[PDB]
Curated annotation (Swiss-Prot), chains A, B:
Changing L54W: No effect on sugar-binding, but loss of dimerization, hemagglutination of human group A erythrocytes and toxicity to Jurkat leukemia cells. One of its GO terms (molecular function) is carbohydrate binding. It comes from the Eukaryota. Homodimer. It comes from Clitocybe nebularis (Clouded agaric). Lectin specific for terminal, non-reducing N-acetylgalactosamine (Gal-NAc)-containing carbohydrates including N,N'-diacetyllactosediamine/LDN (GalNAcbeta1-4GlcNAc, LacdiNAc). Specific also for carbohydrates containing N-acetylglucosamine (-GlcNAc) or N-acetyllactosamine (-Galbeta1-4GlcNAc) at the reducing end. Agglutinates human blood group A, AB, B and O erythrocytes with a strong preference for group A. Agglutinates bovine erythrocytes with a very low specificity. Binds carbohydrates bivalently, which is required for its biological activity. This is Ricin B-like lectin. The modification N-acetylserine is found at S1.
Length: 148, 148
């Protein structure tokens, strides 16, 4: 399982893309997108995500460092194609190991849906897609944000 | 949401029945049943349940005081009629208020299934059943345990 802590999160199909909250904006319904790294070595606070775990399970919340918005599915509408956005309230996610070491799926608990990135263009929105075991557009890797 | 802590858990249709781990047995796959209170004022450790919450959500685990077994759906088989059992691996549950003051449903997240007690017969097993708006055999209330 991924240990609790603060991370950058990169896509496996598109290795030059991080999970990013548009414009560092705290408003409801601000889009979550794929984007190039925006500061060396670990980004500004809109590309750093704090993971909190329910012990002895694979269930987590995800919250940005600055501003302090959670990851949520828009309008709590748990269907194929729905948008990911920033909000004052989270959607709980299940972070599940895949076939290769160090690759994870970010899944909706108990439903056949997962976070996916459909293109390499900068600022493409992240959306839900059907589970597909080997599709690298819905697999992700974690890099720690290390402080002193 | 219900405050974290240690509780007895009584059915709303059948107020003489507590959630109980059969025989205080530590084995994997031991049945969870409805049963009369087994000690004054708050039972032994097989009738006392500790609730741990994921912050800013309604998702919890449930663990008995002695032996220290979690609540699990048998073989992780999330369908109508499946058995509830004791195990070292928990199933995450969503605990949601029902309005009359102090009453709740104990649901499987994102599915229309909930813990149900089918009869008042002593030692009847607890199973999954479908959610509705009116039946009292899928509603539960809580008594705090005073450790001292
Ligand atoms: O059978 C449910 C009931 O078991 C009690 O424990 C019994 C056990 O079943 C029996 O095999 C034995 O030899 O004596 C034990 C003590 O009477 C539990 O105490 C009760 O809470 C239920 O779980």
């Amino acid at each position: 399982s991924i240990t609790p802590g603060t991370y950058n999160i990169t896509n496996v199909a598109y290795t030059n893309r991080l999970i990013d909250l548009t414009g560092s904006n705290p408003a409801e319904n601000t889009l979550i997108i794929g984007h190039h790294l925006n500061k060396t070595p670990s980004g500004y606070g809109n590309q750093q995500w704090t993971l909190v775990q329910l012990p002895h399970t694979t269930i987590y919340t995800m919250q940005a460092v600055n501003p302090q918005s959670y990851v949520r599915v828009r309008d709590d509408n748990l269907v194929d194609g729905a948008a990911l956005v920033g909000s004052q309230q989270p959607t709980p996610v299940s972070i599940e190991s895949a076939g290769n070491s160090g690759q994870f799926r970010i899944k909706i608990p108990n439903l056949g849906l997962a976070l996916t990135l459909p293109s390499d263009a900068n600022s493409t929105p992240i959306v839900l897609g059907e589970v597909d075991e080997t599709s690298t557009n819905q697999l992700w890797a974690f890099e720690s944000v290390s402080a002193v």
